[PDB]
Nucleic acid binder design. Structure first.
Ligand SMILES: [Mg+2]
Ligand SMILES: [Mg+2]
Ligand SMILES: [Mg+2]
Ligand SMILES: [Mg+2]
Ligand SMILES: [Mg+2]
Length: 906
RNA sequence: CAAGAUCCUGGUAUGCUGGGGAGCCUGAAAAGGCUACCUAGCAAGACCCCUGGGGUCGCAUUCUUCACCCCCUCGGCGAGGGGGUU
DNA sequence: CCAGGATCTTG
DNA sequence: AGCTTGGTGTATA
DNA sequence: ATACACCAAGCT
């Protein structure tokens, strides 16, 4: 089932996306777009709030579990040591709250002459010290902990502050003595400060160190006169700690293969999608003869570096619009970026030629650079300097600050001191960190007395993801006969599109969202696939030519500001002649909707089973009146089934409204369990809230996010009714379905699971009547194709959105209640509408009506009724292959299905 | 040539729930609250090895399970991975 | 939150 | 009654 | 710090 063709693979790697293209080639010209797909991934991020990956959250949870296990073992070993020593540990209950602290205080203060009292207090103090021992460096052993200075300087400062605050001296000032005195004198005080957030003054302000607890134990030891072997064993049992080793990590040579993971989340996401696309494309067209990849400036930078980027652009664009409005009030017709550079240099140097004195006006500017552009310089803000005209024609191609000291009319050795002693202002182009970096880089470029080479321009992407992708693609190329694999950076495909008259907005018929300036190509998510298609045309020579054109354009962007020279190469001419039909192929592919935007499905039932907060159980009387919500909150499944048989003897599911009085107060109400009998005065355990919850560890926890929704269809074949059974991981956990050999989308859920407990009442009644059967399953990230008919059940904000954005494909994002599915548009970007909200907030009247609707619509998107979505005839739930084609044949992979015509399972 | 980027390992301090209670505030028929502090647990659980106890795994690898193909590790025989075209 | 490993990949 | 929309809790450092 | 699930008044 394979025919070999000549084709090239284009890979457009992004932070949350990757664009893949298989383009057929005939005579070094594009012939047919075999495949073009944009795949959207999360970057491996599991916690969206903190940016931590799924692997990082799993590792932190695993290490917390290991910490609890070894803490249990260590406390048990201390308990055996205390039993051997005859010292009674602190009891679990029926003791005073301050017994441990007064035991520590009394043992560090006075010698106890009673034998049993001393052993009891010693056991109390030692057990409580092992429960609260403070922090130490984990790579330092017990002996080196014993050799630390005792007490630490942090506890010495804390003890001095406590002595000054409370006007009392405790001798010796140990942590147990001070905490016992504070709990006896100012009750309700809190010892350690609370992270993550009324005038309760905290007793301690620094982190407790292990040497402080060790010194307190030494003071207790030498006050009570304990034997040294006993003290050594107590220290070895309390402060024992496993060393930080490397058990889990494994931490010409062969290149890593496609199936080998690199361990970095976003790179694994991109590589998994790329290896699936490459395997499908090789099985259907044979191997490619060329593979071209680029990587964006993201996907490697940290969240801190992202915060540096947004902290740069907000201050820079505020300063540019401020002096642009000042230049518009100054009479200049066209405000321009180099005019903003010279206005910044007058905002900073206060109109001062350094080399000539002579404060100037706007006419005698004549902007010049410190380093000449032929001699390694560029149009950087550090290199640019304010001039006076007379301080412009005197440099004369010579090195800066080298001929100047060996000449008249100007002096050196005060330039560095004068720049470095200047004051950082409040609001300007640079921030507080960027102004220090600007001053240090200016001084470093002022320190030149010789050549500072050179005018380097040869860009191939060499980051971690870049080298990993090059090694794996070169391994595939050696295994499959690919002629060349080229990985670029930037920044080059935008050039290749703008010199080929390819605009995403014209290509996909996108309405204008910005009132002025150029519309962004990043609004439509298919632009990644278009850039992959364009990337198939690139060769390293023409990529270097386009980079040269971009660099000469941004060099002359400020030169002609106070342009644009076209590329001049036979390779560029041959490439532009060869890519004449690429545009016609792009409109031909876009008009027939062949380009798809898809996301991978998370089908494995792994992750957080429930929420992490334990909650208190409620109690309800058996003989009292039961409402529908109180019957829904019944914790024990046998009692739940017995009350279900009470409210309906033939029924299997609970058919209750949440607010309805289901069954009244009956005084001889008796509930017959299989092994117990519940009297009318007995108390039934209830979940605290009327939502999905499970029993974990003697408490109640809410269910986590839904793993999937099982789609049920009932009614007539021409007017069917639809509902969703939202199944979280807690339903699978309490149903015993998290074992081997279980299809989690079709395995039967018991009625007491929160899925059937909190299903819609129409669905529950139809399943009781036998009319409703499961016709499919929906996961977050499934694509709903509404067909050429589109959405016909729009109302209000969705109507106003679909007037400008007739979106046919929608992505399932969640199931926010029992009758609703949350749908976002597949082709429309997320970061574009988010930062578009930010532009409307800061800048008024800058967005067209469509842009305003997009901004006010994208946060919640289409919180859609299921009955108004699945009632569309011709709606298809599209499960793409790796090439972006909908899987329609029934196999052992998820296939596309139509909710109106899906046959029920089994 | 530093810093990071990804984890990994060992720890700490809170927080939540259950069991308690030092002080305060109510209710006094008795048991409710607040601030702290003490103590146990902190995914559900699975698999060992010996009515419990102890040891290791259990939130990653985005198409679960099933079925086919490929790669790797150990001794047909299980685990790790990978791919599956519409 | 803390220290510190191992490894890449930039140069 | 039923769909729309606004607002908020969520283990964390 | 997110975005998904839940809760609770508005329009119709
Ligand atoms: Mg404890
Ligand atoms: Mg401790
Ligand atoms: Mg792109
Ligand atoms: Mg405690
Ligand atoms: Mg446990």
């Amino acid at each position: 089932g394979t025919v070999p063709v000549t084709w090239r693979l284009g890979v457009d790697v992004g932070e949350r996306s990757i664009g893949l293209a298989a383009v057929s080639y005939e005579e070094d010209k594009p012939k047919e777009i075999l495949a073009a797909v944009s795949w959207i991934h999360d970057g491996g991020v599991g916690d969206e709030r903190s940016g931590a990956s799924r692997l990082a959250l799993r590792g932190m949870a695993r290490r917390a579990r290991r910490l609890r296990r070894f803490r249990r073992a260590r406390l048990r070993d201390l308990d055996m040591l205390l039993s051997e020593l005859g010292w009674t540990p602190l009891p679990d209950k029926n003791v005073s709250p301050v017994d441990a602290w007064l035991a520590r205080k009394r043992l560090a203060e006075e010698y106890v002459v009673d034998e049993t009292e001393r052993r009891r207090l010693l056991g109390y103090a030692v057990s409580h010290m092992a429960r609260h021992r403070g922090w130490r460096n984990p790579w330092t052993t017990i002996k080196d902990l014993k050799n630390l200075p005792q007490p630490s300087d942090s506890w010495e400062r804390t003890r001095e502050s406590l002595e000054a605050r409370y006007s009392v001296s405790l001798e010796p000032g140990t942590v147990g003595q001070w905490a016992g005195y504070l709990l006896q004198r100012a009750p309700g005080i809190r010892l350690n400060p609370t992270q993550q957030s009324l005038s309760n003054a905290t007793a301690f302000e620094t982190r407790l160190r292990q040497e402080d607890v060790l010194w307190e134990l030494r003071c207790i030891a030498d006050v009570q006169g304990l034997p040294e072997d006993v003290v050594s064993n107590v220290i070895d049992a309390v402060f024992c700690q496993k060393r930080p080793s490397v058990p889990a990590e494994r931490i010409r040579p062969p290149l890593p293969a496609l199936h080998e993971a690199t361990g970095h989340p976003v790179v694994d996401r991109n590589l998994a999608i790329l290896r699936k696309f490459l395997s499908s494309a090789t099985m259907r067209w044979g191997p490619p003869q060329s593979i071209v990849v680029e990587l964006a400036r993201g996907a490697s930078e940290s969240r801190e570096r992202q915060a540096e980027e947004e902290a740069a652009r907000r201050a820079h664009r505020k300063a540019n619009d401020r002096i642009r409005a000042e230049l518009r009030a100054s009479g200049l017709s066209d405000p321009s970026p180099a005019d903003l550079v010279r206005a910044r240099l007058l905002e900073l140097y206060d109109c001062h030629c350094m080399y000539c004195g002579a404060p100037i006006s706007w006419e005698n500017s004549e902007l010049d650079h410190i380093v000449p552009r032929t001699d390694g310089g560029s149009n950087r803000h550090e290199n640019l300097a304010i001039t006076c005209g007379a301080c412009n024609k005197e440099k004369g191609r010579r090195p800066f600050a080298s001929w100047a000291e060996t000449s008249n009319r100007v002096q050196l050795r005060d330039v560095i001191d004068r720049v470095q002693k200047l004051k950082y202002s409040g609001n300007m182009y640079w921030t507080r960190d960027e102004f220090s970096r600007y001053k240090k880089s200016v001084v470093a470029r002022l320190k030149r007395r010789t050549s500072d080479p050179e005018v380097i321009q040869s860009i191939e992407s060499t980051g971690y993801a870049a080298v990993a992708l090059r090694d794996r693609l070169l391994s595939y190329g050696e295994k499959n006969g690919v002629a060349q694999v080229a990985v670029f950076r930037g920044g080059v495909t935008a050039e290749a599109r703008r010199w080929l008259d390819i605009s995403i907005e014209r290509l996909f018929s996108r309405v204008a969202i910005f009132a002025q300036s150029t519309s962004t190509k990043r609004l439509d998510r298919r632009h990644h696939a278009v850039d992959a298609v364009v990337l198939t045309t690139l060769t390293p020579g023409v990529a270097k030519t386009l980079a040269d054109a971009r660099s000469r354009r941004v060099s002359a962007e400020f030169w002609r500001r106070p342009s644009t020279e076209e590329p001049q190469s036979p390779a560029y001419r041959q490439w532009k002649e060869s890519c004449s039909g690429l545009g016609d192929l792009l409109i031909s592919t876009a008009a027939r909707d062949s380009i798809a935007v898809a996301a991978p499905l998370r089908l494995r039932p792994t992750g957080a089973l429930h929420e992490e907060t334990l909650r208190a159980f409620s109690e309800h009387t058996v003989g009292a009146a039961w409402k529908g919500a109180e019957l829904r909150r019944i914790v024990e499944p046998e009692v739940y089934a017995a009350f279900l048989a009470l409210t309906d003897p033939g029924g299997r599911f609970l058919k209750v409204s949440p607010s309805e009085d289901v069954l009244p107060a009956d005084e001889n109400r008796h509930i017959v369990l299989s092994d117990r009998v519940l009297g009318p005065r007995d108390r039934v355990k209830l979940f605290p809230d009327d939502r999905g919850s499970i029993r974990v560890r003697g408490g109640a926890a809410y269910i986590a996010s839904f793993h999937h929704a099982r789609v049920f269809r009932w009614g007539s074949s021409h007017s069917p009714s639809f509902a969703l059974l939202r199944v979280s991981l807690a339903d699978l956990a309490v149903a015993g379905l998290l074992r081997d050999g279980v299809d989690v989308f079709t395995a039967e859920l018991p009625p007491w699971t929160p899925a059937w407990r909190y299903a819609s009442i129409a669905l529950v009644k139809a399943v009781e009547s036998g009319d409703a059967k499961q016709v499919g399953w929906l996961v977050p990230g499934d694509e709903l194709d509404f067909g050429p008919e589109g959405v016909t059940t729009a109302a209000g904000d969705l109507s106003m959105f679909l007037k400008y954005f007739p979106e046919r494909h929608w992505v399932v994002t969640g199931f926010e209640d029992d009758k609703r599915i949350n749908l976002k548009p597949a082709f429309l970007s997320a970061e574009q509408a988010e930062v578009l909200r930010t532009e409307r907030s800061d800048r008024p009247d800058t967005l067209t009506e469509a842009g305003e609707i997009l901004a006010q619509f994208f946060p919640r998107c289409w919180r859609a009724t299921v009955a108004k979505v699945l009632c569309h005839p011709g709606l298809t739930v599209i499960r793409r292959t790796a090439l972006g084609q909908p899987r329609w044949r029934r196999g052992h992979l998820p296939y596309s299905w139509r909710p109106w015509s899906a046959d029920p399972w089994s």
